[PDB]
Amino acid sequence: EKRKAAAAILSLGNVLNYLDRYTVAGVLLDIQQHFGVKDRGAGLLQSVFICSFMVAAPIFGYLGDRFNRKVILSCGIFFWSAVTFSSSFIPQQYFWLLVLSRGLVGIGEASYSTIAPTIIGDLFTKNTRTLMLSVFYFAIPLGSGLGYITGSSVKQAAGDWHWALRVSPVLGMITGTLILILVPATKRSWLRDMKALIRNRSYVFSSLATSAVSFATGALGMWIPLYLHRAQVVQKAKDSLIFGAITCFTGFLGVVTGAGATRWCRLKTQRADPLVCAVGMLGSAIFICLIFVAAKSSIVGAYICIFVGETLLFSNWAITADILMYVVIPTRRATAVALQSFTSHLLGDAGSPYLIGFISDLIRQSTKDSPLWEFLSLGYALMLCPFVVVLGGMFFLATALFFVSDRARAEQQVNQ
């Protein structure tokens, strides 16, 4: 029971983690208006966070292995909660202070999101650990949707964008106390692995496909609420609320759709997983293309297109994990996962928000400023993402090309 209590507390911690991650994304319009910065700074607010998370994830993966885990995880949670609450008090004259606070929150969330799954895995046994990790990861879309809803509801209730960053820190400290109390006390080269992995074609192409998925996910999940609000302005705070509910349902249903497609395809071929990923990505790309055309005219069609595009886009998470598990022999599933996460962050979430902001800024600078042209510039900048989704689908098909050969090679090597 105590181990189940620890798993529940860490899952609630993950919910709070993603809520903190997307609270700013919920209320980006107010930050832009108050601080006066253009779209480039708004993109920077998440590019810096993701870069810090990128750089800090391997370090905390190493420190958890070579030091205590409960203390580090709790220090991380009282670190990012305190930093979020402090950053809520930043004056208007300072913006780089807010960006730096986003970076520090990124470091803390890196520590938590890198160490907590190891604790959850160590606590339980095979089937129990599988179920508990499934819950811990189902905490993700719920966390993101609750982050959007919390941001754009504390906005409307309190009346200041500041209070959007003030409600989550208290729960952060409380969950830190519960982690530091309820969780049972924790109990216990790369060169060759990297060369073998870069020689492994299926892993390389699946990693690039995951990078494209992360690019699309970061860029859209940040800029869609603001883009929909600009759509409402041109067409003449429910946008973020409905987007949060849509994100919750799509995160919960995309894995189910992927599992169904994998089940119905595996009876007919061995490359069911990458082919299913590729078809899902192509469908998501088409519907993400249609998001902008729909939102030009009516917003209900935009919400439906978001629903379908997220459902098809979010399906390729468990399937990507399965592909990586199959192609990579057991002795390298640690280095493979670490390098895949680093590469996905490097080519996706790290650069996508700032790149979309920069392209939007250039397009807007071309023409005289107006709300209609703000709409058009943001739409054209976000139009880059469907092309990235199509490219990722191409990379998934390239993975499918070598999937059989590399699965056979992995089985041959492990059977030795």
The residue ranges that bind ligand S1P (CB under 6 A) are: 133-134, 137-138, 140-141, 144, 217, 220-221, 224, 247, 251, 255, 306, 309-310, 314, 317-318, 321
CB atoms within 10 A of CB 80: 27
In whole angstroms, how close is the CB of 59 to ligand S1P at the nearest point? Answer: 23
In whole angstroms, how close is the CB of 33 to ligand S1P at the nearest point? Answer: 23
CA distance 246 to 256: 15
Q: Please identify, using beta-carbon distances, which residue of 289 and 306 lies nearer to ligand S1P.
A: 306
Cα three-residue angle 409-415-416, rounded to 5 degrees: 95
Which letter, b or e, does each residue of 195-233 get, where b requires 16 or more Cβ atoms within 10 Å of its Cβ?
Answer: ebbeebbbbbbbbbbbbbbbbbbbbbbbbbbbbbbbbee
In whole angstroms, how close is the CB of 98 to ligand S1P at the nearest point? Answer: 21
In whole angstroms, how close is the CB of 67 to ligand S1P at the nearest point? Answer: 27
* DSSP conformation letters of 82-115: HHHHHHTT--SS-SHHHHHHHHHHHHHHHHHHHH
Backbone breaks in the chain after residues (C–N over 2.5 Å): 188, 236
In the complex, residue closest to ligand S1P by CB: 221
In whole angstroms, how close is the CB of 102 to ligand S1P at the nearest point? Answer: 17
In whole angstroms, how close is the CB of 7 to ligand S1P at the nearest point? Answer: 14
In whole angstroms, how close is the CB of 147 to ligand S1P at the nearest point? Answer: 9
Q: Please identify, using beta-carbon distances, which residue of 153 and 352 lies nearer to ligand S1P.
A: 352
Q: Please identify, using beta-carbon distances, which residue of 26 and 64 lies nearer to ligand S1P.
A: 26
Residue matched to tokens 């209590």: 5
Q: Please identify, using beta-carbon distances, which residue of 298 and 370 lies nearer to ligand S1P.
A: 298
CA distance 367 to 15: 42
Please count the residues of the chain: 416
CA distance 248 to 95: 31
* DSSP conformation letters of 304-319: HHHHHHHHHHTTTTHH
Q: Please identify, using beta-carbon distances, which residue of 147 and 169 lies nearer to ligand S1P.
A: 147
Q: Please identify, using beta-carbon distances, which residue of 49 and 137 lies nearer to ligand S1P.
A: 137
H-run or E-run covering 224: helix 201-235
Q: Please identify, using beta-carbon distances, which residue of 308 and 404 lies nearer to ligand S1P.
A: 308
